[PDB]
Design a protein around this ligand. Sequence first.
Ligand SMILES: O=C(O)Cc1ccccc1Nc1c(Cl)cccc1Cl
Length: 248
Amino acid sequence: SADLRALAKHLYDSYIKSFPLTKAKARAILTGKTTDKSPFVIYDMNSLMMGEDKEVAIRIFQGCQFRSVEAVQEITEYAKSIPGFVNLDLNDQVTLLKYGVHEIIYTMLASLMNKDGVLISEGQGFMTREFLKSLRKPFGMEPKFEFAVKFNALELDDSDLAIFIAVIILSGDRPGLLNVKPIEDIQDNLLQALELQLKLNHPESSQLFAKLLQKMTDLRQIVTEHVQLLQVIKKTETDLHPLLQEIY
Ligand SMILES: O=C(O)Cc1ccccc1Nc1c(Cl)cccc1Cl
C-alpha cells in the first residue's frame, strides 16, 4: 500500500515536470485567482484577428494541429517516466502512444475548459465555445466540450490525472501490440494505484474509480469521430506534421 502511494507520487512528479500547464494553474486562470494572470478572450472573427496580436477557420485548425503536436511531445516525455514503459518492446512503445495520445489530449483538454470555452497557448488565450460552434465550414470542438463538462464534474486534480493518464497509455488492448502481457502487468499496477489514490483523495466520493474508467468509453467515441473528420478534411484540402502524419 505504501508502494502504491510512492508510485502515485512518482507519476505526479513526472506529470508536473512534463506538462507546463496543469489543471490547477488553468483553474486559477479561469476563476480570476490572483496567483495567475487573466487571459485575452477570442469570441468572434473581429476579436479573433484582434487576438492574433497576440481563411480563419483553416488558420485555427492548423493552430489546433500545432498544439496537438506539442501535446504529443509532452505526453511522450511523460510516458518515458512510467515504470516499465521504456523496458517494453520498442514497436509496442510506439504502438501504445500512437493510439493513446488523442485520448489523453481530450482528457487534459477538459482541464482547459468550462461550459463557455477553452484556454489556449498556455493560458494566454480563451477561445469561446460559441465562437467555435459558429466557425465553418467544416468546423464543429462541440463534443469535446460536452465530455469536458461531464469529465470536470468528477473534480479530479492533477495527481489524479497523472495516474489516470498512465493507465490510458498502458492499454494492452491496443491493436498490433506484440507482447500484451507485460503492458497489462504495468497497467494493473497503475490501476491498483489509481484505486488507492482516488480512495484517499476523494474519500466522500463513491465509485469514482468505476466512474473514472467509464469515461474511457466517451474518449473512444470522441477520438473515432475526430479521425473521421480529419480524413474528410484531408481529401477536401490538398495542401500534417511528420509526427501528425505518423499517427494518422
Ligand atoms: O492550445 C492549447 O493549449 C489547447 C490545446 C489545443 C489542441 C491540442 C492541445 C492543446 N493543449 C494541450 C497541451 Cl499543449 C498539452 C497536453 C494536453 C493539451 Cl489538451
